[PDB]
Design a protein around this ligand. Structure first.
Ligand SMILES: Nc1ncnc2c(CN3C[C@H](COP(=O)(O)O)[C@@H](O)C3)c[nH]c12
Ligand SMILES: Nc1ncnc2c(CN3C[C@H](COP(=O)(O)O)[C@@H](O)C3)c[nH]c12
Lengths: 142, 142
């Protein structure tokens, strides 16, 4: 590809509390590649609306196509989410380069299944504070 | 094996709101096989305590051994959880028999990545109300 393919994960039906931060992360990711999930992140129809359209199977299948295309999977894992975890599980089995970003100031303890999936190279989990997200992404993609 | 191996998924670090229901589900699952995750579900040390022991990598690796042994993976997916989603993602890639149980009375809309993973046979997602969980499990394992 002429540009790296990037897949961004962040809670949607798990809760939209961090939606604005995800947009900030995706904006910085665009400096480093094409973000395949960019335009379906907002879920403008609402969860009930998407369910009512009967589109969840297409959401699963299309997102799994993008996940396999991805050169890097980037996940913000502060807000617990079934879909984010599922994307990470599929991505590990696809042997993907994976970066998870977690905010300790949330007061949560991150899932042991995500923290313990890390090997410090191909699956990396970084703690961070919100103000330094651009600097960390620059470091990861340099 | 002389008994089926069962792997039960339910939120822990995502939140313990449904812990009592999980115990009820696991008690009924014991009628149908060995529940490999039974005795580590309570997390008595606490999330901070387990993290402080440095045990998250062992939690990941040991649970992945049980997940591959499992004849059936049963997940209660009402409470959003990274670990539950991750277990389901790994289980799909292992081509596991999977049953997810979701309570619409939660007022949540279930993750499209879980609802849309279903194919109605090997990956099944059932809506239910809490009082009928034993009857549904009897039906699934009959
Ligand atoms: N408009 C939309 N509606 C539902 N799902 C998606 C997705 C797929 N994944 C879900 C995951 C959060 O998972 P969850 O929804 O369980 O919190 C995110 O990383 C992206 C993209 N756009 C979507
Ligand atoms: N004592 C313990 N501490 C941490 N993890 C585990 C597990 C492994 N999975 C995690 C998943 C919830 O995931 P999450 O913690 O992200 O909500 C559950 O289905 C079981 C068993 N015992 C544990």
């Amino acid at each position: 590809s002429m540009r790296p393919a990037l897949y961004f994960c962040g809670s949607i039906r798990g809760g939209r509390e961090d939606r604005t931060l995800y947009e900030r992360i995706v904006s910085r990711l665009r400096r480093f590649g094409t973000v395949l999930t960019e335009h379906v992140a907002a879920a403008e129809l609402g969860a009930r609306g998407e369910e009512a359209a009967g589109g969840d199977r297409l959401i699963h299948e299309q997102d799994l196509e993008w996940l396999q295309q991805a050169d890097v999977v980037v996940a913000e894992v502060t807000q617990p989410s079934l879909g984010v975890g599922y994307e990470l599980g599929r991505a590990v089995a696809f042997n993907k380069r994976i970066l998870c970003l977690f905010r300790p100031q949330s007061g949560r303890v991150l899932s042991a299944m995500i923290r313990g999936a890390a090997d410090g190279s191909r699956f990396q989990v970084w703690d961070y504070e919100e103000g330094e997200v651009e600097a960390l992404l620059d470091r990861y993609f340099e």
